[PDB]
Write an enzyme that holds these catalytic residues in place. Structure first.
Site, short mmCIF file in Angstrom:
data_model
loop_
_atom_site.label_atom_id
_atom_site.label_comp_id
_atom_site.label_asym_id
_atom_site.label_seq_id
_atom_site.Cartn_x
_atom_site.Cartn_y
_atom_site.Cartn_z
N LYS A 154 4.09 -15.95 2.82
CA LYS A 154 4.01 -16.52 1.29
C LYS A 154 5.67 -16.88 0.47
O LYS A 154 5.94 -16.69 -0.78
CB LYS A 154 2.62 -15.55 0.23
N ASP A 202 -2.67 -18.61 2.27
CA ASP A 202 -3.84 -19.76 1.36
C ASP A 202 -4.05 -20.36 2.64
O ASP A 202 -5.32 -20.96 2.81
CB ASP A 202 -3.67 -19.82 0.66
N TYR A 233 1.18 -1.15 -0.18
CA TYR A 233 0.17 0.12 0.11
C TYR A 233 0.65 1.41 -0.17
O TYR A 233 0.33 2.69 0.08
CB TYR A 233 -0.70 0.05 1.17
N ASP A 274 -10.02 -8.95 8.50
CA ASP A 274 -11.64 -9.17 7.99
C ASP A 274 -12.44 -10.74 8.47
O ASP A 274 -13.40 -10.77 8.10
CB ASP A 274 -12.10 -8.79 6.62
N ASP A 282 -5.04 -7.43 7.02
CA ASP A 282 -6.16 -6.21 6.50
C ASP A 282 -7.13 -7.38 5.42
O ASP A 282 -7.97 -7.44 6.27
CB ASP A 282 -5.39 -5.36 6.45
#
Lengths: 345, 345
Positions: free
Chosen positions: A185, A217, A139, A245, A241
């Site tokens: 990852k 994942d 970001y 959620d 993030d």
């Protein structure tokens, strides 16, 4: 115990005050020395002072030992520009106090099991904390761009930024069940190999806490199949993030959840849930997340882990005894703050 | 209908053959002209031909109209090097047939509702297809790197790569309920603004299909709170990869799920589930995912959407009537392939 209190807009006054009502009771009872002061922040300060984080407040949060933040935001302001709208202030207090890790706990309180989307057996005993790095990676990372032809964005992390959020994670771990899981990852991306070895170096210093690693994942699948298997989860920004959620649906009966930003300056604690203007003044607001952000302050700002757990039992008990209107009961803010107090006497 | 059949290792022979048993029945019954040929692929071809994708097979998948792939992999090979191990071949057939979108359907069959982790009411009527871009973005994107100081990785997409996976998505949509959702992080990343406008340009050409956009974190919450609200979901690589593993827990009783790689060459169809060597030969393997990868071939390779749905009912019916051992029943591969056929007569 020095708290700058910023109750914000909408329901922020009401539910930030029920938090202080629990804290003044423990303060009386244990003599913790609570000194608090209320400061202006948000839509209310745009109106009052002509900006969302006025320098009285800049100073206040700069000098307290904790911030108890309520909620800002209101339609009223959206139309006027950009740096005059409630939410800007939310990033200004993050920048100023140099906050870089966001702690989000998810607990499913045995009494609201039937509200969850998962079958009972999967939510039983969920109690975990995801600490998401706050200021780095894709970001904010660069280079970034957009052409008629293509678009780009870099996930980037330096050793310092990985070690920062990792120490919070281990230290956060010491105070509850002592297991960290870092999420990456690593089997495909190199940012993730890096993240992985650095969380493992830093883990050497915290021997009493267990460390494990998982891929984003596989951890997205574990939060629905076996979420009661984690204590602290530490991850980067976009994966924190996304995974916070997904993890926020496990309680079901939403609105109950606390958040805390930590770092070099003054820790900020707040409920996850906004302003809720629709219901400011009516007295029905559910305070469970403000009372639990207070419990997080006591645990992270003052290290009083043992009182934080006793306030989290009082609110568990209280949720069982008097569900708020929003959870098929009728106990408004005050009557609910009551039975919380009535349990930690 | 020309199918190159690559049954692979372990259980691949058994469950790829129960697929062909359903397909030879429809073929008889509708006269579809099934011509198939079995080719060597995987641990079996390492043994036989000294590599996992020998040029007979290179040619075979190059010239058929569909590949029906089983499963490869076995411990035996891991120890020998890298390009001599089952899985290498899996990327070699992807490169060769220029496959760039991976379709993963999730359905929760009313009879196995109680196996799911979610309460019944959340899984009722789940039927959605996530199509994940396969060859681009941060796993392959560059620049990338790792230093003692830092690590980097670029998510990068060009208009062509976004339009490719988007057309598959719309065309995939036409054959089932006509709604596409594209998933991005457009409100923060510019790769995602780009992805967003391009999926919206391409959508102009497909008027009969509805388009909507969602953020990866909001779509991660929707797959547990309301997953029955989507038809086709199209997204990039790492988000398809994360959201397909979260979506794979919704059925519960795993093993049942089909996968299909699509693109310029020959579409490859396969069950999601590997070799399962432990049980090759015993006759208990659950064929539900091979029989449903066949149903996907008929729908995507030959466009026979109406037969694909009738094979997906026969297997629904069959799952209700004779659960396999792995789902608390006792019907092995053959007895289960039976009742599937016994329904589409």
């Amino acid at each position: 115990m020095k708290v700058a209190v910023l109750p914000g807009d909408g329901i922020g006054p009401e539910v930030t005050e029920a938090a202080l009502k629990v804290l003044r009771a423990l303060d009386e009872a244990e003599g913790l020395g609570l000194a608090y002061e209320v400061f202006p922040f948000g839509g209310a300060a745009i109106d009052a002072f002509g900006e969302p984080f006025p320098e009285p407040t800049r100073k206040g949060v700069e000098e307290a030992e904790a911030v108890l933040l309520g909620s800002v935001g209101g339609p009223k302001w959206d139309q006027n520009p950009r740096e005059l709208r409630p939410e800007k202030g939310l990033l200004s207090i993050r920048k100023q106090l140099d906050l870089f890790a966001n702690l989000r706990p998810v607990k499913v309180f045995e009494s609201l099991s039937d509200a969850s989307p998962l079958k009972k057996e999967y939510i039983d005993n969920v109690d975990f904390v995801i600490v998401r790095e706050l200021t780095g990676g894709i970001y904010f990372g660069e280079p970034r761009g957009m052409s008629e032809a293509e678009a780009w964005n870099t996930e980037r992390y330096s050793k310092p930024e990985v070690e920062r959020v990792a120490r919070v994670a281990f230290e956060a771990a010491r105070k509850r069940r002592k297991h960290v899981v870092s999420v990456d990852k690593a089997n495909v991306l190199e940012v993730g190999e890096f993240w992985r070895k650095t969380v493992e170096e830093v883990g050497r210093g915290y021997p009493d806490v267990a460390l494990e690693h998982q891929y984003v994942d596989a951890m997205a699948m574990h939060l629905v199949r076996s979420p009661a298997r984690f204590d602290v989860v530490v991850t980067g920004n976009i994966f924190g993030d996304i995974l916070s959620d997904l993890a926020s649906v496990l309680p079901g009966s939403l609105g109950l959840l606390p958040s805390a930003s930590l770092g070099r300056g003054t820790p900020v604690f707040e409920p996850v849930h906004g302003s809720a203007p629709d219901i400011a003044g009516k007295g029905i607001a559910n305070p469970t997340a403000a009372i639990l952000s207070a419990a997080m302050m006591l645990e992270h700002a003052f290290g009083l882990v043992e009182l934080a757990r006793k306030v989290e039992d009082a609110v568990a008990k209280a949720l069982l005894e008097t569900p708020p209107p929003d959870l098929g009961g009728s106990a408004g803010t005050e009557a609910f703050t009551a039975t919380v107090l009535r349990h930690l006497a």
